[PDB]
Design a protein around this ligand. Structure first.
Ligand SMILES: [Zn+2]
Lengths: 125, 134, 136, 94, 38
RNA sequence: AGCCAGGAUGUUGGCUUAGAAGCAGCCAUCAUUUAAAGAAAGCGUAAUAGCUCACUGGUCGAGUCGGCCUGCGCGGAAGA
């Protein structure tokens, strides 16, 4: 399990890569094998992208660390976030082609500049 | 959608190959001799893994992947059989250059980030069968 | 099966078992099997039990037996009237008072020891519990 | 740090002690040093859960008696034979 | 139906019950674990 | 607790075996991508495949787990 100290440190790591990151993408992680997920983790370390699946009420505490607070309603449902620490984009262009490749899950809401991007307009990134 | 580990230029004995993927609708001799035509390049005596992909029409496509961590560690330490008592009884040796060759072969075959991750997974299979890394 | 090598006298008075135990504490092992109830332990009982907890530990750690069957019990056989002397010596026993420590143990995981002691106590006539050695 | 609350014993002997033990309280003593001995009573539970730590035996604790602390160590302790209980504690002035 | 005076859980799927003032052990998995006290 | 999802690569770890592939048996039990995934807790195979579990993300919404000490009860408990 996870002690309160565990959760505290992890909130500090998500808040710490969130401050350092240029852009983020929140998505549904449900209904996909660990094979295709390690495939998007290779396509992740190759694109500079930091991949995570983190607790929701943990990510309200980490995203209270600004300026991703427009995403706190995007945390209802299973949360997989892609932070591109190197480049903006390359998460939002990789996820739409991974979700069209799999035809599972969603890829719900993005965040850039301090604002949230609705699901059909993430083609901006 | 089946997998086997088949010796280098070899195929079509009854107990190892024919029944296993032959109850799945696969033509046996095309797999056998296109796999000996592909893996003619693998050294004699090494089992090489082959992933057979079967479709509703019985026409199959197989990816022959690089020889196992355990087989490239049998050959890079010089040995034949590894340990029956691993890290208690130790049966051979490989310098870090062979860990890195086997982990370039398996850099084609791993999930690893760096050749240090693939060298460390070949490190793990190096501690599994007893072999010493020197 | 324990029994005194040689004795001063061959037979004994039935005696009583009264009052409480000495050696209430675990002086050797980390754990011990203490007796809550009061009763006589034949050598057979002690042996069977020691066996049980010897199977249980797969011959690891160590086992002490703190009790000894030093007092001889007699029985006249069947179909024999009263008198004509005292009966012949049948077997040996150890008098047990509440709070004695029958076996000690260590060099083993606690969980396993509670187990082995349950299995040991299955073979014993008297109420028993598990205990840990303490500082002071 | 361990702080034990206590009262001065107005009675003595076997009878007093066994009424003490029936009430879920138990007798102990404080001696050593220039002073006279001080016999006191304690709550069985508090102390039973307190000596459920090891340091209790290696350390300087305090005892609150009629507004007044004393600083002491654990000297020896007699336990009931089969029960998870404490018959008594020798406290030596620290 | 093992009928005895000591009744126990023989696996993880055995579930203890008191029916009509009897203690029984019921299993979904293994019919052989069906017990009653007596 | 339930219910949705995943339970990964090296790899069928080596030994042994006509076969052992997490699951006859012997020994090690590492490392990788990890939210998590035991060189596997059970069913399964000629050996696989196939099925849950450990573990983790989701939904849910406030108490829950199991020992200790005792009070009174239940079973153990059949005869002319
Ligand atoms: Zn059962």
């Amino acid at each position: 399990a996870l002690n309160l100290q565990d959760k505290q440190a992890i909130v500090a790591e998500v808040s710490e890569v969130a401050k350092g990151a240029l852009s983020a993408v929140v998505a549904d992680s449900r209904g996909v094998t660990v094979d295709k997920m390690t495939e998007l983790r290779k396509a992740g370390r190759e694109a500079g992208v930091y991949m995570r699946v983190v607790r929701n009420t943990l990510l309200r505490r980490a995203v209270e660390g600004t300026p991703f607070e427009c995403l706190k309603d995007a945390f209802v449902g299973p949360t997989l976030i892609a932070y591109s620490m190197e480049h903006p984009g390359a998460a939002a262009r990789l996820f739409k082609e991974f979700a069209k490749a799999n035809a599972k899950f969603e890829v719900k809401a993005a965040a850039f500049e301090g604002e949230l991007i609705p699901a059909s307009q993430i083609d901006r990134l | 959608y089946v997998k086997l580990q088949v010796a280098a230029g070899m195929a079509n004995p009854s107990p190892p190959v024919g029944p296993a993927l032959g109850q799945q609708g696969v033509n046996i001799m095309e797999f056998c001799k296109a796999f000996n035509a592909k893996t003619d390049s693998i050294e004699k005596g090494l089992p090489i893994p082959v992933v057979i992909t079967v479709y509703a029409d019985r026409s199959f496509t197989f990816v022959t992947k690089t020889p196992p961590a355990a087989v490239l560690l049998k050959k890079a330490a010089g040995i034949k059989s590894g340990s029956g008592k691993p890290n208690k009884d130790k049966v051979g040796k490989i310098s870090r250059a062979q860990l890195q060759e086997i982990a370039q072969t398996k850099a084609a075959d791993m999930t690893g980030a760096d050749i240090e991750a693939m060298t460390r997974s070949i490190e793990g299979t190096a501690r599994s069968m007893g072999l010493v890394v020197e | 099966m324990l029994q005194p090598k040689r004795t001063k006298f061959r037979k004994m008075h039935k005696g009583r078992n009264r009052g409480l135990a000495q050696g209430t504490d675990v002086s050797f092992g980390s754990f011990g099997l203490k007796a809550v109830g009061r009763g006589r332990l034949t050598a057979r009982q002690i042996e069977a039990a020691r066996r049980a907890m010897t199977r249980a530990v797969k011959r690891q750690g160590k086992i002490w037996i703190r009790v000894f069957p030093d007092k001889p019990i007699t029985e006249k056989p069947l179909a024999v009237r009263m008198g004509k002397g005292k009966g012949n010596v049948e077997y040996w026993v150890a008098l047990i008072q509440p709070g004695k420590v029958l076996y000690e143990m260590d060099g083993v995981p606690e969980e396993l020891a509670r187990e082995a002691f349950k299995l040991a106590a299955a073979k014993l006539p008297i109420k028993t519990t598990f205990v840990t050695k303490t500082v002071m | 740090m361990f702080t034990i609350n206590a009262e001065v014993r107005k009675e003595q002997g076997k009878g007093a002690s066994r009424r003490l033990r029936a009430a879920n309280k138990f007798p102990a003593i404080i001696y050593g040093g220039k002073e006279a001995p001080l016999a006191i009573e304690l709550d069985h539970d508090k102390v039973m859960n307190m000596q459920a730590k090891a340091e209790f035996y290696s350390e300087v604790l305090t005892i609150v008696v009629d507004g007044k602390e004393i600083k002491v160590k654990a000297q020896d302790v007699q336990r009931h034979p089969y029960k998870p209980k404490l018959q008594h504690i020798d406290f030596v002035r620290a | 139906m093992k009928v005895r005076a000591s009744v126990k859980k023989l696996c993880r799927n055995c579930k203890i019950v008191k029916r009509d003032g009897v203690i029984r052990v019921i299993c979904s998995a293994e019919p052989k674990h069906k017990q009653r006290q007596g």
